[PDB]
Amino acid sequence: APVRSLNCTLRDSQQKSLVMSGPYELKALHLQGQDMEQQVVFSMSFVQGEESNDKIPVALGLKEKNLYLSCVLKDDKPTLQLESVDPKNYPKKKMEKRFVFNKIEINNKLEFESAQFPNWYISTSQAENMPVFLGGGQDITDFTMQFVS
Ligand SMILES: COCC(=O)Nc1ccc(O)cc1
Asked: How far is 63 from 146, CA to CA, in rounded Å?
């Protein structure tokens, strides 16, 4: 059938919200009140890949944008980018591996591991207004997920 998707937001375990940082980056900052409209709404797609009770393969697209989080090599290490795709072809059930995250439930939170790069996770900094990155400590790898209409 058609790939299944849900709209959602993510916050890090320090309750920082994610926002756009120019066209191909996200940043995390403390947001409350009217400013919470700046937060990115994801379309989380449930994709093909290796699955267990608490390991669920997803893609993270920006709602109604042909942009996906992807894990791509740079300076010889796994890194997080926003990548444009053909809007005719996405989302799809068989997403390419660079777009796949294992959504893992650990102690009432979520971690998003790169399917491509084992043990590299979507991360934030403790400081305000710094990029979201891929991290292999002080950095934050746990999130909560709010399901949106
Ligand atoms: C199949 O997913 C089960 C579940 O409880 N997921 C979950 C959702 C939001 C959150 O903040 C923590 C965990």
From this structure: 14
Number of domains comprising the chain:
1
Helix/strand/coil for 25: coil
DSSP 45: E
Q: Is 144 in the pocket of ligand 1 (CB under 6 A)?
A: yes
CATH code: domain of residue 23 = 2.80.10.50
- Resolution of the PDB structure in angstroms: 1.5
Ligand 1 nearest atom to the CA of residue 143, by list position: 11
Distance in angstroms (rounded) separating the CA atoms of residues 53 and 105: 9
Instruction: Give the domain extent around 95.
Output: 1-149
Q: Cα dist. 124→6, 19, 72, 85 in Å?
A: 23, 12, 18, 25
User: Residue 117's Cα: distance from chain center in Å?
Assistant: 14
Q: Whose CA is nearest to atom 7 of ligand 1?
A: 145
Cα of 132 from ligand 1 centre, angstroms: 21
